[PDB]
Symmetry: none
Subunit: 211 residues, 2 copies
């Protein structure tokens, strides 16, 4: 009956909240909807039996809306939360549902880039330039003055971009992208972001093996 979420813990630290942008988008949704929930943590390098009972395929995040039935995939979970707890509404107009869609994959490529001439920096910057033009013309958030589902999905992605790219590449989202900087500052300073984000330490620790 009680809402439960299972999210990624740090490797070797089953009691420390991990760097999953998908899990964090789910956490941001429950925080913004003001739902009371139990947050379970899982170290996938040492999966406990309770985790394998609720997630037989080892998927994270998993969500239990209070019916004992666990469901996977962040797109699915957030939309089931929107359907079951519709107020406060977090619906993003379909018109803007794909703003910033190429930013996360662009980031990972440039983070992994060992070649300073494969066009990966330029590609990420062009995606960030588009985001800036959108935010410039359409409120502080993706859908105007109010936060919506697109923000809760993009936010963790841009947060990973900010922390991992600074640590690994010494690269920052350029300050001339004033609209993305206004967005970043507002999104991250919301009580929901402050209560659900990983520490920079464990965001960097979570990407280090992949770099």
């Amino acid at each position: 009956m009680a809402v439960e979420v299972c999210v990624k813990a740090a490797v070797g630290a089953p009691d420390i909240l991990g760097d999953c942008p998908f899990s964090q988008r789910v956490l941001l949704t429950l925080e913004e909807k003001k739902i009371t929930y139990e947050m379970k943590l899982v170290d996938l390098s040492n999966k406990p039996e309770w985790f394998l009972k609720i997630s037989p395929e080892g998927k994270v995040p998993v969500f239990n809306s209070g019916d004992g039935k666990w469901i996977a995939d962040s797109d699915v979970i957030t939309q089931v939360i929107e359907e079951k707890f519709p107020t406060p509404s977090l619906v993003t107009p379909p018109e803007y549902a794909s703003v910033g869609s190429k930013i996360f994959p662009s980031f990972v490529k440039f983070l992994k880039s060992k070649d300073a001439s494969d066009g990966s920096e330029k590609a990420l910057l062009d995606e960030l330039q588009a985001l800036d033009e959108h935010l410039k013309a359409h409120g502080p958030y993706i859908s105007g003055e109010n936060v919506s589902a697109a923000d809760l999905s993009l936010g963790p992605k841009l947060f990973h971009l900010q922390v991992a790219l600074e640590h690994f590449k010494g690269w920052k989202i350029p300050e001339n992208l004033t609209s993305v900087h206004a967005y970043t500052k507002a999104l991250f300073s919301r009580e929901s972001f402050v209560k659900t984000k990983p520490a920079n330490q464990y965001l960097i620790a979570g990407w280090a093996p992949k770099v």
Copy 2:
């Protein structure tokens, strides 16, 4: 296969805040006016990183990359290369007026550093400001008429330094009777590109303070 980038001076102790370099500002104004997609990379010169040390080994700013991997120094060179690679919109200033106000920045620094009022540094600055007023009254509102050009983007940031520092350290102003210089200054400093790249007064004052 590279992004358009520029390394510029950051505020001291604030690597995510733009600083007081008028030459970096000129390049920044050029990139903004041309509407080019670019990334400004901030460099605190009091804490120079190794990524900056590589691109610009002599530790100088601004340095520019148009997307070819070739780091170019000197704002005179940079703004002209930007004009060649991206001619539209045009910022070409007619050669007739390309050197209008070229003596003002060194006369400002000379007068600011001056302790002796009999130096001639003050009078020399005045004559140049007076000369600028006449040119701007005849060929204004900008150095080349109704629209901004390269000369305005070079002179603009220099005039802002003169205005802030001379007021701060001496209580000195560009005489109000220079109505065209004042109209030009009001117009330049209010443009989007200028509002955006205009340094906070303290950065500029704290920079000149040791030199004064």
